[PDB]
């Protein structure tokens, strides 16, 4: 066991091993920037807030730990270290998580000017490469957006917080019951279109304005999609809205790579059953410069049977404590 030291940052008291130095605040948790003297890397340290205050808090603490311990992918935020100042389970009251400090997120990267097509190719390829890994473990991000994409100054990308309304899929906006993993593919399309054009694709003012902007581009549901909506009140709610066909994306993204327009067409389909997948998008000719079918790995099967269990606080805390003691750091 290493020696810990204490210091308060922005009213938050931190208890970390001496190995992590130069704590600097970055932003249900609190994140700090730090220098790992053991490896020489700049790391991000997250202190979980009130991790065992309630059953819901304890299950969320166990969920984030099991999640990060399983993700071992260069484009997915993984676990560099987990520690706690406690020496037993009865003392176990705080949890700290350490990962890479990329330096920034994709947020507001385009507010002044758009990115080149080659720059977008490299950024979107990394998101999809990590999404194929995340989806292979049967995990849906559900809420992908520029702030969930950790990026460094060389545009190397890692997906963050896996498992604003401008990047949310239409089926989630309409509160439909069934979702597949392509709800994240819709988010990537909204992100990709924003990087190419310099402007948000669907900057809706409220909830109905968000849906109305979406249906103006992708069109109202055709006959094949209407036949799959079970609720009759939901069916007439789209016939409540005005009818208009799907736009030709070539007439929307003027001056863009025709391969980029073709990829957005496959990503922004209203019917999520016909939406392109992460593995299929990696094989698109738009990523010919970066696609390597032998360097796009999938994840080990991920056990999520704990999500349907109702346990006590002391049981979730003991399960979380077992995952801390069994953590083996990466190479
Ligand atoms: O680069 C990173 N790393 C980040 C880690 C975490 N939280 C976190 C998750 C899991 C952990 F295990 C530990 C954590 F700290 C959050 N945003 C991160 N950004 C993006 C960013 C954005 C602006 C300024 C600096 C950094």
CATH number at residue 54: 3.30.200.20
- Residue 78 sits in the same domain as residue 197: no
- Give domain status of residue 319, yes or no: no
- Residue 205 sits in the same domain as residue 58: no
What's the distance, Cα to Cα, between the start and end of the chain in Å? 20
Q: Domain end: 82, 101, 120, which one?
A: 101
Kindly state if the Cβ of 150 falls inside 6 Å of ligand 1.
Answer: yes
- Residue 226 sits in the same domain as residue 280: yes
The best mutation among 34, 78, 99 to test binding of ligand 1, ranked by most ligand atoms within 8 Å of the C-beta, falls on 99
Rounded distance, CA 130 to CA 298, Å?
Answer: 9
The best mutation among 9, 23, 31, 83 to test binding of ligand 1, ranked by most ligand atoms within 8 Å of the C-beta, falls on 31
- Residue 225 sits in the same domain as residue 283: yes
- Residue 59 sits in the same domain as residue 180: no
Question: Two tokens at 306?
Answer: 């704990």
In sequence order, which residues have a C-beta less than 8 Å from that of residue 38 and are 6 or more positions away?
19
Number of domains comprising the chain = 2
Rounded distance, CA 152 to CA 102, Å?
Answer: 5
Q: 31 C-alpha vs ligand 1 centroid, how far in Å?
A: 7
Q: Please state the atom number of ligand 1 nearest to the C-alpha of residue 32.
A: 15
Kindly state if the Cβ of 65 falls inside 6 Å of ligand 1.
Answer: no
Q: Domain end: 54, 84, 101, which one?
A: 101
Length of the chain: 331
Looking at 105, 117, 143, 161, which residue is catalytic? 161
- DSSP-derived letter for residue 248 is -
- Residue 164 sits in the same domain as residue 52: no
Q: Domain end: 66, 81, 101, which one?
A: 101
Kindly state if the Cβ of 261 falls inside 6 Å of ligand 1.
Answer: no
- Residue 36 sits in the same domain as residue 135: no
Residue 183 is part of a domain; what is its CATH number?
Answer: 1.10.510.10
Annotated binding-site residue? 26: yes
Rounded distance, CA 25 to CA 7, Å?
Answer: 12
Give me the domain span that covers residue 138.
104-287
- Residue 119 sits in the same domain as residue 239: yes
Annotated binding-site residue? 5: no
Kindly state if the Cβ of 129 falls inside 6 Å of ligand 1.
Answer: no
Q: How many helices (H) and strands (E) does the chain have?
A: 10, 10
Kindly state if the Cβ of 269 falls inside 6 Å of ligand 1.
Answer: no
Alpha-carbon separation of residue 230 from 176, 211, 212 (angstroms): 10, 20, 22
- Give domain status of residue 323, yes or no: no
- Give domain status of residue 312, yes or no: no
Quick one: which of 264, 122, 266 has its CA closest to 201?
264
- Residue 169 sits in the same domain as residue 276: yes
CA 232 to chain centre: 33
User: How do beta strands 41-48 and 20-25 pair?
Assistant: unpaired
- Residue 281 sits in the same domain as residue 227: yes
- Residue 27 sits in the same domain as residue 89: yes
Experimental method: X-ray
- Residue 163 sits in the same domain as residue 280: yes
94 included as an active-site residue? no
């Amino acid at each position: 066991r290493p020696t810990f030291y204490r210091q308060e940052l922005n009213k938050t008291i931190w208890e970390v091993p001496e190995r992590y130095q130069n704590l600097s605040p970055v932003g249900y948790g609190s994140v700090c920037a730090a220098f790992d003297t053991k490896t020489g890397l700049r790391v991000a340290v997250k202190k979980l807030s009130r991790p065992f205050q309630s059953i819901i808090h304890a299950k969320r603490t166990y969920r984030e730990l099991r999640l990060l311990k399983h993700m071992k992918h260069e484009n997915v935020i993984g676990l560099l270290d987990v520690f706690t100042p406690a020496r037993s389970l009865e003392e176990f009251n705080d949890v700290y998580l350490v990962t890479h400090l990329m330096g920034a997120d994709l947020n507001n990267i385009v507010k002044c000017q758009k990115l080149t097509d080659d720059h977008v190719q490299f950024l979107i390829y990394q998101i999809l490469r990590g999404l194929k890994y995340i989806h292979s473990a049967d995990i849906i991000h559900r809420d992908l957006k520029p702030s969930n994409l950790a990026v460094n100054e060389d545009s190397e990308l890692k997906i963050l917080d896996f498992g604003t309304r401008w990047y949310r899929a239409p089926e989630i906006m309409l509160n439909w019951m069934h979702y597949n993993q392509t709800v994240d593919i819709w988010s990537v399309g909204c992100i990709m279109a924003e990087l190419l054009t310099g402007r948000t694709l669907f900057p809706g003012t409220d909830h109905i304005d968000q849906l109305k902007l979406i249906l103006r581009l992708v069109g109202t549901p055709g006959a094949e999609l209407l036949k799959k909506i079970s609720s009759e009140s939901a069916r007439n709610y789209i016939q409540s809205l005005t009818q208009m066909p799907k736009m030709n994306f070539a007439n929307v993204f003027i001056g863009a790579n025709p391969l980029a327009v073709d990829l957005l067409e496959k990503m922004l389909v209203l019917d999520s059953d016909k939406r392109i997948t992460a593995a299929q998008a990696l094989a698109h000719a738009y990523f010919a410069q970066y696609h390597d079918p032998d360097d796009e790995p999938v994840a080990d099967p991920y056990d999520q049977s704990f999500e349907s269990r109702d346990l006590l606080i002391d049981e979730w805390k003991s399960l979380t404590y077992d995952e801390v003691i069994s953590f083996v750091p990466p190479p």
